[PDB]
Design a protein around this ligand. Structure first.
Ligand SMILES: O=C(O)CCC(=O)C(=O)O
Ligand SMILES: [Cl-]
Ligand SMILES: [Fe+3]
Length: 265
């Protein structure tokens, strides 16, 4: 599978100028979606923050002073929503916006492992700003009258993985953060696979998820990908589960009965 270098080629988006740099990168990002099926930006300084986060998650996975103390089935969950917490074995954690706000006891995993938790909250905030502006770019590619994506902070979650087939996300958008190793591969519009060069870089990839495929009525296919020789993290952005779905069919906004929560089930 051919390598796809992105360092120095994707638009640069600086940590303390995200909104303005994303505005300037808009046309480049549109052309990536049109020409690749996924999007990319280089974010100077993100790699350091993500590597530290990942490396501290790896340390926490071996501690006993223990992450399975915060397995999803013993962590307070929202009445309506997904499932944050730790998923033992290949082993990963879901750090939701709600969890970062302690919505109460749900933030205990971060109090128990506050070095990892401080990095994860930081990376969540950056990734959520990025992905919200990626969503604005995609929205601007959609017909006039397209509603705002309305990504929800509480329902969005950051996944961090410790030991790892073709698939796409179910949610609105995903933001792949630079992994520890190479192997993540994406399919182009012609059915050929490429391997973005992202390990140990500052490059983030933005994925179309199946919720946005549905909302855009098929205009944007999911950013299908797979992993093939180890740590990794990705933000999964969701709208509010209780909001009713919508769909832009042939230029017409149609409000459906089902909710976004129904889409997942
Ligand atoms: O394991 C990785 O490097 C990325 C896994 C993946 O597909 C994702 O986080 O969405
Ligand atoms: Cl995914
Ligand atoms: Fe994935």
């Amino acid at each position: 599978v051919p390598l796809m270098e992105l360092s120095g080629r994707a638009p640069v988006v600086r940590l303390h100028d995200i909104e303005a740099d994303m505005a300037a990168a808009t046309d480049a990002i549109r052309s990536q979606l049109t020409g690749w099926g996924f999007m990319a930006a280089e974010v100077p300084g993100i790699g350091e923050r993500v590597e530290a986060m990942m490396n501290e998650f790896a340390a926490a996975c071996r501690a006993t002073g223990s992450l399975s103390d915060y397995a999803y089935d013993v962590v307070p969950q929202l009445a309506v929503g997904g499932t944050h917490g730790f998923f033992p074995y290949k082993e990963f954690i879901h750090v939701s916006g709600a969890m970062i706000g302690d919505q109460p006891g749900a933030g205990d995993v971060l109090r128990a492992f506050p070095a990892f938790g401080t990095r994860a909250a930081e990376v969540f905030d950056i990734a959520f700003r990025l992905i919200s502006l990626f969503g604005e770019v995609v929205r601007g590619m959609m017909p006039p009258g397209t509603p705002e994506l309305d990504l929800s902070h509480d329902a969005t979650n950051l996944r961090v993985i410790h030991y790892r087939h073709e698939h796409s996300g179910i949610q609105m958008l995903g933001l792949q953060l630079p992994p520890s190793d190479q192997g993540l591969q994406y399919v182009l519009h012609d059915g050929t696979w490429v391997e973005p060069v992202i390990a140990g870089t500052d490059v983030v990839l933005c994925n179309i998820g199946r919720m946005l495929t549905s909302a855009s009525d098929g205009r944007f296919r999911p950013s299908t990908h797979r992993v093939h020789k180890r740590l990794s993290s990705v933000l999964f952005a969701y709208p509010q589960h209780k909001a009713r779905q919508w769909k832009m069919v042939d230029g017409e906004l149609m409000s459906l009965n089902a909710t976004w929560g129904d889409f997942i089930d």
